[PDB]
Write a protein that binds this DNA or RNA. Structure first.
Ligand SMILES: [Mg+2]
Length: 604
DNA sequence: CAACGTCGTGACTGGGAAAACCCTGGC
DNA sequence: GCCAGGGTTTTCCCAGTC
DNA sequence: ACGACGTTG
């Protein structure tokens, strides 16, 4: 770490000299810093650059600390750097460049030449290799501990903002960060040049997805606090009466959200044997035992409704309206990308993905999500997309014929297992079939099937054998992928994304079974996520090309929620059909079920 | 070396509450 | 030196996608 | 209900 070899820039002439160094550099680190972690407001503080290793410069344009001399106006710096920033040819590297692009766009400047981002480099090298933030990269490829903001800030309360810190140590911090990013890129990129499939995935899918994520985050989502506030009162009422009834049944007052007290009082009153134990080892009060014991006593069922209602109230109606952005009135998520081993995206801050559906109050909270005036919600969805993936990859003639006809075998198997007629199967039974069938594809044991559907374990075994008799090509494909994981030491997706499994070697056996099932799991879900990502890329490309009133707000796993004006509905629906159907070259069509409604629940 | 008792027995996520424990500050 | 409180960690348990 | 692994005879 060639520290203290950098420079802090306080004059515009040295800024001209620095950019005259920059424009001819092939790649150069670039990062910006701000006081707050919320990108939406995020008033800017400063920026840094670095051309060659050991050399970096910081320009403080906004600080408030006592006696700040000759800090360059942010306007002049932005005007001078705009030709470099808006240039497409210029190639840049950095950390969390989505944040940087968002901050720049807050001032009306769109960064174009996003060449490489270190976190994506590390993620595409090896998904399961620890954390992918800056500290882990520094530790595992530079072996040099770096100065963190905690060192110059407070412990847990008095974390003074980056604007009110002195220029010297702040500039050294920023220059060191930019430099470490630079050597990380220079070390990591040639190593990625070695492999082919990961290189193609990195060049095609991952990187161009930063601007679309930034724009989607900047769009925001609209919600009404009023409906949530109203629903909260009925939640509180219902929980009050159910709690009163439960405590009159027990004759004692205890917290029904406290698992310890619940299990103690239950197992000391009923005196019945505990059927299942916690993974750490203890009496447990999970769902399935509760539905099992509800037939005998009213306390199990009433605490079941209590658990559901309390979870709903304490999570959704108490987090969603509180986190609304003040100046815009629209909720903003995070959408971190390099977090999952498989490759799918994951919402972080408010987690607008696990919105309850099955419960009537769940579809009510779904109804709560509404659109602004003259705008209608449009949903574009794949159906059984990974089933089409699996049929394409295994070339099983049964699945090929079923998808050629378009049969809802996903629902037909539910009708068979539950005994329901094909026409009377409901949504929850469809979800249960989803779980059962797809676990059966993923090696889900017959004991798990007996637990899920309450059917005898013998029936679970026999019907698993039957299901694999229908599709023997599927079984031999899992066997082939197991052999591939054993030999290669990893599993690769169709487009080239990889998952390294260090547990494929013999280790107590049981651990390998999880590693084995993950080896089967990785390709299918990875390809589904990659198809979703490329569909988003093409859709947003058309968005930027045409610039109509359509906006994109939300991404749910196998779902793309839109925002269109009420006047134009069918045209954008056909456009989405054309782009989303033709995004991926696959044997069977990627059938899409478009939907339009007033609010989110109306769409689906 | 064999038999029996115990430990699992789809994947991928975030997060809430409760509780426990440990570290540090104050008297 | 000791106790209490707060912060951090650990356990159950539950809400989604397939 | 059944297989895997550790412990004990
Ligand atoms: Mg971010």
């Amino acid at each position: 770490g060639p520290h203290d070899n950098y420079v802090t820039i306080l004059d515009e002439e040295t800024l001209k000299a620095w950019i005259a160094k920059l424009e001819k550099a092939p790649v150069f680190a670039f990062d910006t810093e701000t006081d707050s972690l919320d990108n939406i407001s995020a008033n800017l503080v400063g920026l840094s650059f670095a051309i060659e290793p050991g050399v970096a410069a910081y320009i403080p344009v906004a600080h408030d600390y006592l006696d700040a001399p000759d800090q360059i106006s942010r306007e002049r710096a932005l005007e001078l750097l705009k030709p470099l920033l808006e240039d497409e040819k210029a190639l840049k590297v950095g950390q969390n460049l989505k944040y940087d692009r968002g901050i720049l766009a807050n001032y009306g400047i769109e960064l174009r030449g996003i060449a490489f981002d270190t976190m994506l480099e590390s993620y595409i090298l090896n998904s399961v290799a620890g954390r992918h933030d800056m500290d882990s990269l520094a530790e595992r490829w530079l072996k040099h501990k770096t100065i963190t903001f905690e060192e110059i800030a407070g412990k847990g309360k008095n974390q003074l903002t980056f604007n009110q810190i002195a220029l010297e140590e702040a500039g050294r911090y920023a220059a060191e960060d930019a430099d470490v990013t630079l050597q990380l890129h220079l070390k990591m990129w040639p190593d990625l040049q070695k492999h082919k499939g990961p290189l193609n995935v990195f060049e095609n899918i991952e990187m161009p997805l930063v601007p679309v994520l930034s724009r989607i985050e900047r769009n925001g989502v609209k919600i009404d606090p009023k409906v949530l506030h109203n629903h909260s009162e009925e939640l509180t009422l219902r929980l009050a009466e159910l709690e009163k009834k439960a405590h009159e049944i027990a004759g004692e007052e205890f917290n029904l959200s406290s698992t310890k007290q619940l299990q103690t009082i239950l197992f000391e009153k009923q005196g019945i044997k505990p059927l299942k134990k916690t993974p750490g080892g203890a009496p447990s009060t999970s769902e399935e035992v509760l539905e099992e014991l509800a037939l005998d006593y009213p306390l199990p069922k009433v605490i079941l409704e209590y658990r559901g209602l309390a979870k709903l109230k304490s999570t959704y109606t108490d987090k969603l309206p509180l986190m609304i952005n003040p100046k815009t009135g629209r909720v903003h998520t995070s959408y971190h990308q390099a977090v999952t081993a498989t490759g799918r995206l994951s919402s972080t801050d408010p987690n607008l993905q696990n919105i309850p559906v099955r419960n009537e109050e769940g579809r009510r909270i779904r109804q709560a999500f509404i659109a602004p005036e003259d705008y209608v919600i449009v949903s574009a969805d794949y159906s059984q997309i990974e089933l089409r993936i699996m049929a394409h990859l295994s070339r099983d003639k049964g699945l090929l014929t079923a998808f050629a006809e378009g049969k809802d075998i996903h629902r037909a198997t539910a009708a068979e297992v539950f005994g329901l007629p094909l026409e009377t199967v409901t949504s929850e039974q469809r979800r249960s079939a989803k779980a059962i069938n797809f676990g059966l594809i993923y090696g889900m044991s017959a004991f798990g099937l007996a637990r899920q559907l309450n059917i005898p374990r013998k029936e679970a075994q026999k019907y698993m054998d039957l299901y694999f008799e229908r599709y023997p090509g599927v079984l031999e494909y899992m066997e082939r992928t197991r052999a591939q994981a054993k030999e290669q030491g990893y599993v690769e997706t169709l487009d080239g994304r990889r998952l390294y499994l260090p547990d494929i070697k013999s280790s107590n056996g049981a651990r390998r079974a999880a590693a084995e099932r993950a080896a089967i799991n990785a390709p299918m879900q990875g390809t589904a996520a990659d198809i979703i990502k490329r569909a988003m890329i093409a859709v947003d490309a058309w968005l930027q090309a045409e610039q109509p009133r359509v906006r994109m707000i939300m991404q749910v796993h196998d779902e793309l929620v839109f925002e269109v004006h009420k006047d134009d509905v069918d045209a954008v629906a056909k456009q989405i059909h054309q782009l989303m159907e033709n995004c991926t070259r696959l044997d069977v069509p990627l059938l899409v079920e478009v939907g339009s409604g007033e609010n989110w629940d109306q769409a689906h």
